[PDB]
């Protein structure tokens, strides 16, 4: 069972309204645990998980200062790309970055990554070798050259293989009770009438952690690939997740359809039916 540390980083310009907004949001697995937001009354790195209480003010100071340096570097980037793309000074633009690492259950690095976008399109990315870059257009080629000349990938690789892995192990230890838990889904089926003697049956799964889950509708020991609708698994506001999946069946035939729920927290998968 692997784990990941990811940061989602965004810088968004806003001509006429002051400095760009700048935000860093960090996750261990699917759980938000830290956040920095330049628009806050008092912009600083803040805990978003209770177990992060285990870090002393030194940590918060160090991270905040890094974040403030990152903010400055991204303001510079926004300006740089504006020029390279020969774009008006009047429009808003966005830079995005995802940065982080994944480790195995033994705490060993599996993969590291860092990928940039501009205005929502691939810009530059670190390759799997952690040594070389892939640029997506001609402006990114300039950045690629700068970073080759400055040895940026070796710097990044040292963070991804060193710092990133080490902090992730420590977060997993400190938040063990929260991060390593399993919450079993609780499920139920709803029924909605339709025109033309057909019914919607909707299977809900609630209150689960971690986020990975599978819901299926079966007819005759067979899985339904069509007329089946669903939503992406989503957070429920308390650090648990939910999902639903529906199928449209002939009225009067409801009892022949079953919903199946597979989850880390279910030694045996759930089987449910519409209960009139």
């Amino acid at each position: 069972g692997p784990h990941s540390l990811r940061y989602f980083v965004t810088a968004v310009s806003r001509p006429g309204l002051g400095e760009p907004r700048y935000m860093e949001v960090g996750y261990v697995d699917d759980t938000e645990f830290v956040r920095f937001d330049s628009d806050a009354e008092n912009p600083r790195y803040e805990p978003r998980a209770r177990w992060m209480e285990q870090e002393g003010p030194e940590y918060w100071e160090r991270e905040t200062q890094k974040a403030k340096g990152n903010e400055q570097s991204f303001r510079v980037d926004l300006r740089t790309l504006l020029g390279c793309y020969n774009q008006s000074k009047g429009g808003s633009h966005t830079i995005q970055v995802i940065s982080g690492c994944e480790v195995g259950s033994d705490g060993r690095l599996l993969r590291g990554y860092q990928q940039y976008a501009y205005d929502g399109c691939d810009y530059i990315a670190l390759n799997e070798d952690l040594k070389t870059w892939t640029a997506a257009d001609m402006c990114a080629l300039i950045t690629k050259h700068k970073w080759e000349q400055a040895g940026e990938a070796e710097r990044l690789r040292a963070y991804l293989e060193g710092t990133c892995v080490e902090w992730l192990r420590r977060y997993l230890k400190n938040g063990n009770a929260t991060l390593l838990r399993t919450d079993s889904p609780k499920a139920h089926v709803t029924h909605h009438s339709r025109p033309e003697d057909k019914v919607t049956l909707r299977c809900w799964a609630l209150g689960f952690y971690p986020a990975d889950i599978t819901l299926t509708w079966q007819l005759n020991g067979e899985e339904l690939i069509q007329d089946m609708e669903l939503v992406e698994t989503r957070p429920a506001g308390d650090g648990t997740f939910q999902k639903w999946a529906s199928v449209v069946v002939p009225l009067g035939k409801e009892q022949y359809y079953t919903c199946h729920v597979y989850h880390q927290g279910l030694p045996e998968p759930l089987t449910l039916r519409w209960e009139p």
């Binding site: 510079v76 860092q114 940039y116 710097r155």
Partner: peptide, 8 residues
Amino acid sequence: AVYNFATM
């Protein structure tokens, strides 16, 4: 802990 990013 977050990376200290380089300028582009």
